[PDB]
Amino acid sequence: AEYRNWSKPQCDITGFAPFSKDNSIRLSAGGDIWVTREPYVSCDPDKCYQFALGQGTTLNNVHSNNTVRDRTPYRTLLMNELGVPFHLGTKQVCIAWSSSSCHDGKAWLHVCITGDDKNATASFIYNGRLVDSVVSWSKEILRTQESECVCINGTCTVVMTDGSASGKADTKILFIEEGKIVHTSTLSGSAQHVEECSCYPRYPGVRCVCRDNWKGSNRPIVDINIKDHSIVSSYVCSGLVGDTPRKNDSSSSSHCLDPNNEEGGHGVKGWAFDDGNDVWMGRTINETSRLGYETFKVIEGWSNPKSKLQINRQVIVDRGNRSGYSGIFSVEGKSCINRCFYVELIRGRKEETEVLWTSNSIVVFCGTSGTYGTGSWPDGADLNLMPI
Amino acid sequence: AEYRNWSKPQCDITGFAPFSKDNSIRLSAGGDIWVTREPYVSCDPDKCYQFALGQGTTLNNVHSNNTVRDRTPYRTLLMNELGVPFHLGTKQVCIAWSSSSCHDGKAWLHVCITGDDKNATASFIYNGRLVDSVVSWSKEILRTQESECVCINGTCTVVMTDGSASGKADTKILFIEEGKIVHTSTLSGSAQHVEECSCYPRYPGVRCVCRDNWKGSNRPIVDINIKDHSIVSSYVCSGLVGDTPRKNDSSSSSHCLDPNNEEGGHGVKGWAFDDGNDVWMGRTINETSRLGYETFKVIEGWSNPKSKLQINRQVIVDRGNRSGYSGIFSVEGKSCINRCFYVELIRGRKEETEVLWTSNSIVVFCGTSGTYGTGSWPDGADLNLMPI
Amino acid sequence: AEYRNWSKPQCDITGFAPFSKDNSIRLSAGGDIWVTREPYVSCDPDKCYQFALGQGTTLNNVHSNNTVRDRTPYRTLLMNELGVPFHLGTKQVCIAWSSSSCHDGKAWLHVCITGDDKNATASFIYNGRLVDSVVSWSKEILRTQESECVCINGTCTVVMTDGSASGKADTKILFIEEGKIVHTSTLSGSAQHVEECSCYPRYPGVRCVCRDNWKGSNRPIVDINIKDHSIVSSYVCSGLVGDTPRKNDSSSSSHCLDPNNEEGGHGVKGWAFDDGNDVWMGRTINETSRLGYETFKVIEGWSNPKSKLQINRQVIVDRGNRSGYSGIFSVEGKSCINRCFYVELIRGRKEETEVLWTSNSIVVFCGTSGTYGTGSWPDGADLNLMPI
Amino acid sequence: QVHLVQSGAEVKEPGSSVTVSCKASGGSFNNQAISWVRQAPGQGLEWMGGIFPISGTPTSAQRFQGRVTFTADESTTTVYMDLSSLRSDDTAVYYCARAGSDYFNRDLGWENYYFASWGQGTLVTVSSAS
Amino acid sequence: EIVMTQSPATLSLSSGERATLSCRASRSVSSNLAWYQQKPGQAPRLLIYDASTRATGFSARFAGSGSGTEFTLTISSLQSEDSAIYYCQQYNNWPPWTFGQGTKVEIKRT
Ligand SMILES: *[C@@H]1O[C@H](CO)[C@@H](O[C@@H]2O[C@H](CO)[C@@H](O[C@@H]3O[C@H](CO[C@H]4O[C@H](CO[C@H]5O[C@H](CO)[C@@H](O)[C@H](O)[C@@H]5O)[C@@H](O)[C@H](O[C@H]5O[C@H](CO)[C@@H](O)[C@H](O)[C@@H]5O)[C@@H]4O)[C@@H](O)[C@H](O[C@H]4O[C@H](CO)[C@@H](O)[C@H](O)[C@@H]4O[C@H]4O[C@H](CO)[C@@H](O)[C@H](O)[C@@H]4O)[C@@H]3O)[C@H](O)[C@H]2NC(C)=O)[C@H](O)[C@H]1NC(C)=O
Ligand SMILES: *[C@@H]1O[C@H](CO)[C@@H](O[C@@H]2O[C@H](CO)[C@@H](O[C@@H]3O[C@H](CO[C@H]4O[C@H](CO[C@H]5O[C@H](CO)[C@@H](O)[C@H](O)[C@@H]5O)[C@@H](O)[C@H](O[C@H]5O[C@H](CO)[C@@H](O)[C@H](O)[C@@H]5O)[C@@H]4O)[C@@H](O)[C@H](O[C@H]4O[C@H](CO)[C@@H](O)[C@H](O)[C@@H]4O[C@H]4O[C@H](CO)[C@@H](O)[C@H](O)[C@@H]4O)[C@@H]3O)[C@H](O)[C@H]2NC(C)=O)[C@H](O)[C@H]1NC(C)=O
Ligand SMILES: *[C@@H]1O[C@H](CO)[C@@H](O[C@@H]2O[C@H](CO)[C@@H](O[C@@H]3O[C@H](CO[C@H]4O[C@H](CO[C@H]5O[C@H](CO)[C@@H](O)[C@H](O)[C@@H]5O)[C@@H](O)[C@H](O[C@H]5O[C@H](CO)[C@@H](O)[C@H](O)[C@@H]5O)[C@@H]4O)[C@@H](O)[C@H](O[C@H]4O[C@H](CO)[C@@H](O)[C@H](O)[C@@H]4O[C@H]4O[C@H](CO)[C@@H](O)[C@H](O)[C@@H]4O)[C@@H]3O)[C@H](O)[C@H]2NC(C)=O)[C@H](O)[C@H]1NC(C)=O
Ligand SMILES: *[C@@H]1O[C@H](CO[C@@H]2O[C@@H](C)[C@@H](O)[C@@H](O)[C@@H]2O)[C@@H](O[C@@H]2O[C@H](CO)[C@@H](O)[C@H](O)[C@H]2NC(C)=O)[C@H](O)[C@H]1NC(C)=O
Ligand SMILES: *[C@@H]1O[C@H](CO[C@@H]2O[C@@H](C)[C@@H](O)[C@@H](O)[C@@H]2O)[C@@H](O[C@@H]2O[C@H](CO)[C@@H](O)[C@H](O)[C@H]2NC(C)=O)[C@H](O)[C@H]1NC(C)=O
Ligand SMILES: *[C@@H]1O[C@H](CO)[C@@H](O[C@@H]2O[C@H](CO)[C@@H](O)[C@H](O)[C@H]2NC(C)=O)[C@H](O)[C@H]1NC(C)=O
Ligand SMILES: *[C@@H]1O[C@H](CO)[C@@H](O[C@@H]2O[C@H](CO)[C@@H](O)[C@H](O)[C@H]2NC(C)=O)[C@H](O)[C@H]1NC(C)=O
Ligand SMILES: *[C@@H]1O[C@H](CO)[C@@H](O[C@@H]2O[C@H](CO)[C@@H](O)[C@H](O)[C@H]2NC(C)=O)[C@H](O)[C@H]1NC(C)=O
Ligand SMILES: *[C@@H]1O[C@H](CO)[C@@H](O[C@@H]2O[C@H](CO)[C@@H](O)[C@H](O)[C@H]2NC(C)=O)[C@H](O)[C@H]1NC(C)=O
Ligand SMILES: *[C@@H]1O[C@H](CO)[C@@H](O[C@@H]2O[C@H](CO)[C@@H](O)[C@H](O)[C@H]2NC(C)=O)[C@H](O)[C@H]1NC(C)=O
Ligand SMILES: *[C@@H]1O[C@H](CO)[C@@H](O[C@@H]2O[C@H](CO)[C@@H](O)[C@H](O)[C@H]2NC(C)=O)[C@H](O)[C@H]1NC(C)=O
Ligand SMILES: *[C@@H]1O[C@H](CO)[C@@H](O[C@@H]2O[C@H](CO)[C@@H](O)[C@H](O)[C@H]2NC(C)=O)[C@H](O)[C@H]1NC(C)=O
Ligand SMILES: *[C@@H]1O[C@H](CO)[C@@H](O[C@@H]2O[C@H](CO)[C@@H](O)[C@H](O)[C@H]2NC(C)=O)[C@H](O)[C@H]1NC(C)=O
Ligand SMILES: *[C@@H]1O[C@H](CO)[C@@H](O[C@@H]2O[C@H](CO)[C@@H](O)[C@H](O)[C@H]2NC(C)=O)[C@H](O)[C@H]1NC(C)=O
Ligand SMILES: [Ca+2]
Ligand SMILES: [Ca+2]
Ligand SMILES: [Ca+2]
Ligand SMILES: [Ca+2]
């Protein structure tokens, strides 16, 4: 075995084709399935795995009530091969109410965060054993990507934040080698708030697109250098913006350096990636709620801040059906690196008061150079019938 | 490891001996088992796997109601080792309401079809990752074999159809190498309708026996050339015909080139294979409904269109018990290639109104050169007792 | 890998120490567990497996009613690692209402029997695929060992019987190589009825101790030669006899060549093995019902027909608790071959009318050269409380 | 109300083609199939074909299979039927009707294919006369 | 493919009396059977479906009967408006959806 280096070119994407679906909430009405939120996907050299943050309970269970809170002592990181639902035989890999994972070509790294809100701990677990730990530096909810980390030549990188959601916050990038922390860099450039990054290898470096809860409805960008630990940052130029809430496409605007100050506060985790001067991205179909999901290409949208020319639209979930977080992952092929994405399908409280629980399904899509048609792939559970 | 080439001779079959049974519907009355239809079997070099199209639900579940429709957004391809029933720990390999699978000697290929009826997509997944995709060419339910594909020297082949069930339709044969589509051929020769083929290696080529929903109660044949991508087609000569519905054996006829025009419309998926000038085949015992199942040899039945001389009859399921789809698979032995077959045992709606669901068990048999006796192996669930 | 040859000497046994227990009926009162009878144990070079004949149903299930019949179309051979109970994820290896299995050092052989009482088939499955088959020769319930076969230098042997339980019957020994039948020998010597043999390697040959349903309460012996396919037979000399029913120890007798004609009709499957002129054996504690289980050594009991001198008695199950079939298996150590045995613990109908079902647990013991104490290890389910 | 409304009557020369159309008064094209049935003078009813208005699978009777085509538009909420290579024998009243059927299963075929509601009927006649 | 045979060809009876019509299928159509009424110079109208249940336009005086291969329609106390042609139609699973050749009713007044 050898470390990953991602040094192949990016594949010629024409759009996205279906790859996987879990059916978790429909199976839960007659079966023992875990309650979860904040899922993600990541792959070793042979196959892909699905991850999620459990709520320490199955769904048809007295402990499923009030499962809406994000931080409790009972949350753990669940891990399965992609397409096996989270049944009672699932492995718990670490204690965590926030996490990230990646495979360096020889073994898994998990980054796991737990403890008191104002004095939290992060554990680094590598090849099945604890190797390092660090403590909250700003004493106000230490947090990380809820999605895969990226590793080149044995060095992994992860983005971590501490401090306020509606003001200035402290963000650092940690460089890690076989679980040992080797270097740390503070965030630099013009990005002013940085949460829940989605990251992809872009050899020789790493590139991340993130959430701005404070002032942007345009998304921040962070570029990371693996050879000298340097950092730079900016915003996605496209006039069609990716955050939720946002202004309608008739009236939205963006800036390559600054938060646009349009419907800026709050947000949702998402993704975008460069394709020359074009950008591919995904977003909720509705502008003020997490309903539907669409993807498209914007012409010159990586470099021209006034562009609104979209092409190759696809609906993934139609406008009447709930969505949630979404994120990128990368897969190495015979001659190029492909890009794939996943979407969280949230059900139950607080919006759907027919039940006492909150949980999710998922659906997954991968980039194709071939051709494709149309459909919609929602969650598909009937909350009027199944257990309260 | 090396690619498969199937270059051994066919084994000296004297009939079929029992190999496996799943008991799925009996286990479902006290256990969490998937709802399924359209099963098949296929083998890697070490062991055999069972496949099916799930309905996105367990059987003792509110979502099991109205499971009779064949196309929905929630259908997925299930995969297990042969003889392990589809419990909650089963892997979902792809999103699909029609499929085929095969192993080339190094890895699995899955061909998966989903989307809108009039704009559907086919995904090609090889060694665990999406490699290619194609779109419906006639905009009228793109569909494939519901049974294993065949691969020689690394090139796999699959038969696909688009267009009408009761008129002329568009059929193509796709040639695939490590998931990449490398060539495509249009159907040629005198076969006029071609659905749900059952295919077997016949080195240096591949041979397929199919369903004619339009005009034949005799079955179509397609011969495929792997070295030059050429195609030819015809019909099974035997005076004892294999489709359902059909005329009784006293009055049925066949033609080596044309549909017989006897009870021609509609059909069922089935199989036959050559043994010199003789043919082995299986069919429903009843002429106008999917009840019972029998196999036999017809003397000169591959080359003489007037022959009705049968020998070596075996009952697999007796005339009082439901059957369904059936199909061939091939297994490599120490010195020859053996032929084996499977039968779907359908239960519930629309015929059995004691329940709200529709599902299946299976039973599996393999060719022997030794000796054998008699029996009957039906589904064996009691729908009067178990959950509605 | 290489074939097994068992050419090490037998270990110096002083008695038997506990090795394993399944708890199946106690787990069944809150869990999905298979209904079974006729269990056995067998080992590959790395670990031991438990086998049983399923009744095609879980225990808390409508199909569990009337599970007392021994032959139906739904029986299958279940296989697990020793100590994992038969839950819904268990593999079914073949269709069977009678069976035997063994591992030759490279792969598993299973011998599986099913079909009509008067026209039954035996299938030979080796390395995961069907290799051979044979038909009932006397048209009256073809049957085999319900325990492991034995293999030396790649040749496996199995004992099979057809014909009456209360009169003369036809018995043959089949010699098998990678699933192909290579030779067949008819039973020879003075044994007059031979059922359900328990067999052990005794290099260069194989030795078996069996059930006589017709005239003996002493047990038959069969010695098998692997190099020339010759057979001889006789009876266990010991004055303390091993079958049930039998006369009390004050009045029982035996003969080295003939059935003793004492309480001869009916019987139970059991075991014994030679230790110089001494014999080790196990039996039910009660003389006329399958209650309790004990083991002991008889001094000169392999060669002196008048000996009644026992030593080293151990109770395995006390006289108030149900037992059932029992059988030997052999395990290769660093410098000698050890002997181990298992006991079936039957519960439910026809004796225990509190429930509608019939099923079993097991318990397993191995030979030791060290020291040991005392206990009793019964089934331990409460049929007054659990589901009917 | 839902009810179907048809296009007006026609005279066409032999060897020509004719278009007939059928529109829902309620705007309410759900996926229940729209079917064409004809009645020659003093003669029995004859099914020609049909289409599902949303899912768009067409179907045609064997005698007409080379000559006829069906197409649909939700915007005009109209189904269009084109009959080609006309002859004197095609002189008939052509009705559109709405079937009880709204899904086609690959394996099992159709269900509830009976005609619940009918249009006015359109007279088409094939002749050289002015 | 499946042939529908309907009889009698013509029926004539006075008002205030019962009338009966029959239909036969060349293979069993398992209750997938409908009846239509056509009044002169008008589009047909659905009278009965699944051999057994009557459409909203028609009252208790119309009844359906039979199964498998033979089917029957009965009209109770015949009235002036019943003077019409009636057809059976099968819909068993696969095309084509064949009609019967029809039966004419005319009323034997004074
Ligand atoms: C079956 O499956 C396939 C695959 O999924 C489906 O195909 C896909 O269909 C979608 C439809 O949404 C397409 O995305 C859309 O693309 C257009 C942009 O492309 C159009 O305009 C191009 C530019 O045209 C101008 O300039 C040229 C010169 O350069 C002039 O000639 C023109 O006159 C114009 O002035 C043009 O180049 C394109 O042509 C090419 O593509 C088509 C196929 O679409 C081919 O037939 C052509 O031959 C050629 O190859 C094309 O005409 C965007 O406009 C779409 O976004 C708008 O619409 C969305 C809803 O559809 C809406 O939500 C967006 O907000 C956006 O609407 C706003 O902007 C509009 C202008 O952009 C305004 O007019 C509007 O009011 C609003 O303000 C969308 O991105 C996919 O590209 C296509 N994919 C592929 C691979 O073909 C197919 O539809 C399915 N079929 C069925 C029956 O289901
Ligand atoms: C236990 O298990 C075993 C294994 O499963 C069972 O054995 C199997 O039994 C079935 C019975 O169905 C056999 O299949 C049947 O085979 C016959 C054809 O074979 C018969 O006819 C041969 C031709 O005979 C003519 O020609 C010769 C000269 O060539 C003349 O001498 C004759 O007089 C005739 O004119 C003949 O060669 C055969 O003999 C050989 O086989 C038998 C064993 O069957 C041996 O004893 C012989 O020694 C010899 O080796 C033999 O006599 C077919 O006719 C059967 O099909 C008909 O019957 C079906 C129902 O059984 C029916 O559904 C079919 O539609 C079909 O019936 C139609 O056609 C008939 C003529 O073909 C008409 O008469 C009829 O009215 C109707 O129109 C069927 O294919 C298996 O071959 C046999 N398998 C093996 C390996 O032996 C065994 O039965 C079980 N035992 C018990 C007790 O359960
Ligand atoms: C804790 O755990 C350990 C290990 O499990 C327990 O130890 C084990 O205990 C059992 C008790 O059942 C022993 O099995 C029994 O063995 C005796 C045979 O052995 C005795 O007799 C020997 C022969 O004696 C005669 O000959 C010698 C000369 O050779 C003379 O000196 C004598 O006077 C006699 O004439 C003798 O050699 C033995 O001595 C050796 O063993 C003992 C330990 O047992 C040592 O203390 C000695 O130092 C020495 O090493 C010994 O005295 C059998 O008789 C038993 O079978 C009878 O009893 C059964 C019930 O117990 C019954 O069901 C049988 O049917 C049978 O009864 C019938 O036959 C009898 C005569 O045989 C009749 O008298 C009777 O009426 C009836 O007709 C049984 O096989 C184990 O050997 C022993 N194991 C070990 C390894 O030590 C221990 O008990 C546990 N402790 C506690 C507190 O729980
Ligand atoms: C990443 O490392 C490569 C060298 O390859 C790695 O080490 C190998 C032993 C093996 O483990 C591979 O799988 C790894 O990917 C660096 O490439 C070298 O760069 C130096 C300096 O320019 C040069 O002297 C070498 O010839 C280069 N070797 C090759 C094969 O190109 C590369 O620079 C590293 N990249 C980053 C971003 O750190
Ligand atoms: C069983 O076979 C042995 C030979 O060993 C086997 O073959 C080896 C290649 C390897 O696969 C081993 O694991 C096998 O156990 C026979 O022993 C030989 O006998 C012949 C004739 O007397 C003699 O010429 C050889 O030297 C012997 N070899 C050894 C190693 O002793 C043995 O006779 C066979 N026994 C039976 C009962 O069949
Ligand atoms: C990235 O890693 C790959 C291996 O996955 C390296 O490719 C190998 O390079 C060596 C040295 O030239 C060859 O011996 C191998 O045959 C190559 N393997 C393959 C699969 O191509 C690659 O050199 C690395 N990239 C960089 C920039 O160092
Ligand atoms: C965007 O989503 C919102 C919230 O899901 C939609 O708001 C609803 O609008 C309808 C009327 O159109 C009202 O009856 C509901 O009460 C609204 N719900 C809430 C919670 O306010 C909105 O219609 C969507 N808009 C678009 C353009 O997609
Ligand atoms: C088909 O594949 C087999 C391997 O499975 C080929 O057989 C091998 O051929 C090579 C070259 O002569 C030998 O070194 C091996 O010993 C053969 N192996 C076995 C198991 O026989 C075979 O040649 C291939 N067939 C064709 C037509 O190419
Ligand atoms: C499959 O591949 C084998 C090689 O593995 C092909 O066999 C070779 O054919 C060429 C051309 O005739 C010869 O030069 C070689 O000597 C052959 N090798 C062997 C081992 O026979 C075979 O033709 C291929 N078959 C198909 C159907 O593609
Ligand atoms: C095999 O099929 C033919 C054709 O349907 C049957 O022959 C008909 O039998 C019926 C009575 O059952 C008669 O009413 C017809 O007149 C017969 N038609 C012809 C053309 O002969 C024949 O009965 C069937 N055979 C069996 C054994 O059922
Ligand atoms: C073939 O199967 C059909 C349908 O399963 C059988 O038809 C049934 O026949 C009996 C009387 O014999 C009737 O009571 C049922 O109503 C029929 N069912 C249907 C749905 O029509 C038929 O008997 C079988 N025939 C043969 C010769 O096997
Ligand atoms: C039985 O099998 C064993 C292997 O399990 C044989 O022992 C080996 O014999 C060869 C040849 O002399 C040696 O090279 C190995 O070192 C031996 N291995 C061990 C573990 O001892 C043994 O010879 C076989 N017995 C017979 C009778 O052939
Ligand atoms: C062992 O078996 C013998 C034979 O059955 C028993 O001897 C009989 O005992 C009964 C009373 O229980 C008497 O009625 C008979 O006359 C006896 N028969 C003979 C031939 O002696 C003996 O009791 C049994 N031993 C034990 C300990 O139960
Ligand atoms: C041997 O086992 C039998 C049967 O399990 C015992 O027989 C029972 O004896 C009691 C009285 O002691 C009766 O109440 C029961 O009705 C008997 N059962 C049957 C089925 O007959 C017997 O006691 C045991 N004897 C010994 C010596 O172990
Ligand atoms: Ca924001
Ligand atoms: Ca339960
Ligand atoms: Ca047909
Ligand atoms: Ca006995």
From TrEMBL, chains A, B, C:
Known activity regulation? Answer: Inhibited by the neuraminidase inhibitors zanamivir (Relenza) and oseltamivir (Tamiflu). These drugs interfere with the release of progeny virus from infected cells and are effective against all influenza strains. Resistance to neuraminidase inhibitors is quite rare.
What does the UniProt keyword field contain? Calcium, Disulfide bond, Glycoprotein, Glycosidase, Host cell membrane, Host membrane, Hydrolase, Membrane, Metal-binding, Signal-anchor, Transmembrane, Transmembrane helix, Virion
Cystine pairs annotated here are C11-C336, C43-C48, C94-C112, C102-C149, C151-C156, C197-C210, C199-C208, C237-C256, C340-C366
Annotated Gene Ontology cellular component terms? host cell plasma membrane; membrane; virion membrane
How is this protein situated with respect to the membrane? Answer: Single-pass type II membrane protein
Q: Active-site residues?
A: D70, Y325
Name the Enzyme Commission number(s) assigned to this protein: 3.2.1.18
After translation, the protein is modified as follows: N-glycosylated.
Q: Which metal ions or organic cofactors does this protein require, according to UniProt?
A: Ca(2+)
Q: Name one GO biological process term.
A: viral budding from plasma membrane
Compartments in which it is found = Host membrane; Virion membrane; Host apical cell membrane
* Region (Head of neuraminidase) location: 10-388
Look up keyword Iron-sulfur and say if it applies: no
Entry binding sites for substrate: R37, R71, E195, E196, R211, R290
Q: Which amino acid positions bind Ca(2+), per UniProt?
A: D212, G216, D243, G264, H266
Q: Which GO terms describe its molecular function?
A: exo-alpha-sialidase activity; metal ion binding
Query: So which domain of life are we looking at?
Result: Viruses
What does the protein in this record do?
Catalyzes the removal of terminal sialic acid residues from viral and cellular glycoconjugates. Cleaves off the terminal sialic acids on the glycosylated HA during virus budding to facilitate virus release. Additionally helps virus spread through the circulation by further removing sialic acids from the cell surface. These cleavages prevent self-aggregation and ensure the efficient spread of the progeny virus from cell to cell. Otherwise, infection would be limited to one round of replication.
Quaternary form?
Homotetramer.
Q: What is recorded about the protein's domains?
A: Intact N-terminus is essential for virion morphogenesis. Possess two apical sorting signals, one in the ectodomain, which is likely to be a glycan, and the other in the transmembrane domain. The transmembrane domain also plays a role in lipid raft association.
Protein name in UniProt: Neuraminidase
What organism is this sequence from? Influenza A virus
> What stretch of the parent protein is included here?
82 to 469 of 469
